[PDB]
């Protein structure tokens, strides 16, 4: 019952006017398939994700690295109320999901800054593309854009995105990280220290159920650039739309982690199909519960009609998994009787909603099989529809749902979902305190774990750039979704007995070069205080993010620890497109490097750019 009124291109179907493909043709070979309903496809698609997860992250390595990680966390002298202990099984599990999930989100932001940096460098020609090629598809417009900026990962197709994907951005596979963990041990009303040690070794049944239904979604900038360019008068508006999308994505990532730590089971996304499907009488029903989201989607396909309902994921505490419907596209029946097939979505709620709007507006042109295949492929595989006109339509709806004039607003729903989550944390903690005691309850529902950005998390860094023997590890400080005081610590472990490792922090003007020599233990590097707008004053200038670079010799690993002084820091209001174009920062200097081999004693400290000549950002002008 929603009339967007957005202009949509006409879609030409592969099936034709008969609305059914001819047997043994080229069209029938290139038609979309149903990857969820077919067991052979779904059983497989689980196997590849498991192989991808175990290849990049090994359970044996993660078990071994537990002891060293605990020692590093202990050496971070946190307060008595904010201490994180990894000898507790529940805390260790939450750290594993948090560290993996944060690393993928951190890598995405690093690429976004580079793409923004590249766009600003070629601002003159990017403007020419936007105005001149007004009448063109989003994919074609983007393909021109990434070609002219001379940026890495030029390919925009799904195969190209998969090929040029880092090891850290692989989505986390929930069931893999929940393997071999003891669950459900009983102490039988014993408070002795030996019994308490046993109780901390295991986890509760709920946490195992939460882990088996978890799957992270991380969105690449090259996919994000398509909905931004559908309406882009200038390059600045292109940049603003990039920030609006990713700020919303980061907000949803924090909510997803909070769902694991609250103390309740996450519902599973599933599809209902008839027991014995009859030709020309079949119906499909899809219920999507995005773990990284504040809203859900229910899509029903009955014949040639498509109906959807967007429902709140908070407040459904009365014998139902669905809250109030915030947006109605028709009538959806969730009481349909049929077989129950579960799946994990690889797209966010806005993306799935964007496609179902386009599918509804193109239901008459497309066939029933095309609607099923295009929807299932996108939801389960993150594969964009092959129909170029349909794909361009979906990115127009993606822009509308993200822009300020969206039919549904997200700041209101994200705020409520936060309120619902921490209220449930108190209720679950209070109930468990009464039933079994405070000592056991603290073991199973830690207070320190609040959000992806609130919690004190560590992020390993991989380095591939070597400057005269010094490996370079880059960590992007910020942006932040909270205000308060934050600390950053750098841990360096090398093969040599004595080490000489340096750090460098790049701001808008000038950079700060420091030297430390303590290894195998955390070293505190930088302090920040960020205000209500998420902006920090660094050496007299307003910044949103900073660049951190570590230079080492014969390094094996470098880890960065972040923590807030106060537990559960408040959240800044989520940024939008209007406030992103209101103020303009510069990140061009983040690519500047230094050579520690040629560093002298006098170059250390905080030096502005004008103290150096053109190039040679390591040695000082005499």
């Amino acid at each position: 019952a929603y009339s967007s009124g957005l202009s949509q291109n006409s879609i030409i179907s592969l099936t034709g006017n008969d609305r059914t493909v001819a047997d043994g043709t080229f069209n029938s070979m290139i038609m979309p398939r149903a990857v969820i309903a077919n067991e052979r496809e779904h059983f497989m698609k689980t196997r590849i994700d498991k192989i991808e997860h175990d290849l990049n992250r090994s359970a044996k390595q993660e078990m071994m690295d537990r002891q060293s990680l605990a020692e590093d966390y202990n050496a971070l002298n946190l307060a008595v109320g904010q201490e994180i202990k990894l000898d507790i099984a529940t805390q260790h599990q939450l750290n594993r999901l948090g560290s993996a999930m944060y690393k993928a989100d951190h890598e995405r932001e690093t690429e976004l800054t580079d793409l923004i940096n590249r766009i600003r460098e070629n601002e003159v020609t990017v403007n020419g593309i936007l105005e001149n090629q007004k009448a063109i598809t989003a994919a074609e417009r983007a393909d021109l854009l990434l070609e002219v900026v001379a940026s890495t990962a030029k390919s925009v197709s799904a195969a190209g995105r998969a090929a040029a994907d880092g090891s850290g951005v692989v989505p986390v596979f929930g069931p893999s990280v929940a393997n071999g963990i003891k669950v459900g041990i009983d102490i039988a009303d014993s408070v002795a220290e030996a019994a308490i040690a046993v109780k901390e070794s295991g986890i509760i049944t709920q946490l195992n159920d939460v882990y088996h239904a978890f799957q992270s979604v991380h969105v690449a900038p090259n996919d994000v650039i398509k909905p931004a360019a559908v309406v882009a008068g200038t390059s600045t508006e292109l940049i603003g739309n990039l920030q609006a999308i990713y700020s919303r994505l980061r907000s949803h990532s924090d909510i997803g982690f909070k769902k694991a730590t609250v103390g309740d089971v996450i519902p599973n996304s599933y599809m209902i199909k008839p027991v014995n499907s009859t030709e020309y009488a079949s119906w499909q029903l899809y219920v999507i519960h995005p773990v990284q989201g504040s809203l859900g989607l229910v899509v029903q396909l009955m014949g040639d009609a498509l109906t959807y309902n967007v429902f709140a994921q908070y407040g459904n505490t009365s014998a139902s998994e669905f809250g109030k419907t915030v947006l109605t596209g028709g009538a959806t029946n969730t009481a349909l009787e049929g077989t129950k097939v579960k799946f994990q979505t690889k797209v966010t709620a806005q993306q799935a909603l964007a496609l179902t709007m386009a599918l509804k507006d193109a239901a008459s042109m497309l066939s029933q099989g095309e609607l099923i295949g295009y929807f299932e492929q996108y939801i389960n595989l993150a594969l964009e529809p092959d129909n170029l006109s349909l794909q361009d339509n979906m990115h127009k709806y993606h822009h509308l749902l993200t822009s300020q004039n969206s039919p549904i607003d997200w700041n209101y729903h994200d705020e409520e979902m936060h309120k619902w989550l921490d209220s449930r944390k108190t209720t679950n903690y209070d109930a468990m305190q009464k039933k079994d005691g405070t000592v056991i309850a603290d073991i199973h529902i830690p207070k320190v774990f609040n959000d992806l950005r609130n919690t004190t998390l560590h992020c390993k860094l991989e380095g591939k750039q070597t400057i005269a023997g010094y490996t370079v590890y880059e960590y992007l400080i910020g942006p932040w979704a909270h205000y308060g005081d934050i600390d950053y610590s750098v841990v360096v472990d090398t093969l040599n007995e004595e080490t000489k490792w340096y750090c460098e922090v790049i701001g808008i003007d000038g950079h700060l070069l420091i030297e430390k020599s303590v290894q195998h233990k955390p070293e505190k590097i930088l302090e920040l205080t960020v205000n209500d707008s998420g902006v920090t004053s660094f050496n007299g200038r307003n910044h949103d993010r900073l660049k951190l670079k570590v230079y080492v010799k014969d390094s094996l690993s470098v880890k960065v620890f972040r923590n807030w002084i106060g537990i559960n820091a408040p959240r800044v209001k989520t940024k939008m497109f209007n406030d992103h174009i209101g103020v303009k920062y510069d990140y061009s200097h983040f690519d500047k490097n230094i050579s520690p081999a040629h560093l002298t004693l006098t170059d250390l400290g905080w030096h502005t750019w004008d103290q150096y000549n053109a190039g040679n950002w390591t040695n000082i002008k005499p």
Binding site: N132, K134, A135, I136
Partner: protein
């Protein structure tokens, strides 16, 4: 910006307004019919080795029997036909033929003066304006086939807007190399050699890539209502004869290479429909002039 125009469409002089009544149109039609019979009689006279058929045709045309010592100009009909051609071209040419002479000559044969009962296709291509950005050179050469040469010396591709007027029915563009053309705010298509356009659609944008020059050949076709006796081949020959014989030498007048250019240029002007109506009558007069002069050279 820089604008370019076809040479023949610039400053059409006003046409005459005198001999346009029903009687005058009858006289021009009668002259065409009688002159055609005269040229047919001359051919028959040569074949039969006798001057009898030519004498009968000349007496009907000239209202006097031919005489050997005289020069056989054509009589009063030839003089009247010559003066109406002068008056039709320009408004400054005086009308010296009395109306009583026109009516008398109109009664020699019974023909209808309907000048709008048929049609003829004219091939002059109207390019009202070509607007080009800076650092681009555009030259227009040709009237029957317009070749437009464009050279781009700028940093990026340029958008050249073509305006073919609202009068032409169809225009066909063929380029030396494939190029892309589209209307205002339509998506540009792939490079294609030949385009067929209706000028009423609107201004057309040509994207000009940087590099070797691109030449577009333009051919048009427009429909003008004419009498059924119209013959384009005879009119073109008559136009050259009248121009060579000094029938169009009036001050403040513009000259054209062909009758196709004259009628099309006079059509892309203020009061174009009324101007074309007079031009069609002039064409039928030139058709009679061509036939009568070839039979009776002077």
């Amino acid at each position: 910006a820089n604008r370019a125009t076809s040479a023949f469409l610039d400053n059409p002089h006003p046409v005459g307004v005198n001999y346009v009544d029903e009687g005058s149109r009858q006289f021009v039609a009668v002259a065409e019919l009688l002159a055609s019979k005269l040229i047919d009689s001359s051919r028959e006279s040569d074949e039969s080795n006798s001057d009898v058929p030519f004498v009968q045709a000349y007496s009907k045309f000239a209202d006097d029997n031919p005489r050997h010592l005289r020069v056989k100009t054509g009589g009063k009909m030839a003089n009247a036909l010559t003066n109406v051609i002068r008056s039709y071209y320009s408004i400054n040419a005086p009308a010296i033929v009395p109306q009583v002479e026109i009516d008398r000559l109109a009664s020699k044969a019974t023909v209808s003066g309907d000048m709008y009962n048929s049609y003829a296709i004219f091939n002059s291509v109207p390019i009202v304006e070509v607007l080009s950005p800076a650092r681009t050179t555009v030259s227009i050469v040709g009237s029957d086939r317009a070749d437009v040469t464009m050279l781009n010396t700028g940093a990026g591709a340029a958008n050249i807007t073509f305006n073919f007027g609202q009068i032409a029915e169809t225009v066909i563009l063929k380029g030396s190399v494939p190029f892309q053309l589209a209307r205002l705010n339509q998506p540009m298509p792939a490079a294609r050699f030949t385009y067929k356009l209706r000028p009423l659609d609107g201004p057309f944008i040509v994207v000009l890539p940087v590099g070797n020059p691109l030449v577009i050949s333009a051919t048009a076709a427009t429909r003008i209502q004419v009498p059924l006796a119209f013959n384009k081949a005879l009119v073109e020959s008559g136009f050259q004869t009248a121009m060579n014989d000094g029938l169009f030498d009036i001050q403040n007048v513009n000259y054209y290479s062909s009758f196709d250019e004259f009628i099309i240029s006079q059509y892309h002007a203020q009061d174009g429909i009324n101007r074309v109506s007079t031009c069609v009558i002039l064409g039928l007069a030139l058709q009679a002039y061509d036939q009568m002069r070839r039979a009776l050279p002077v």
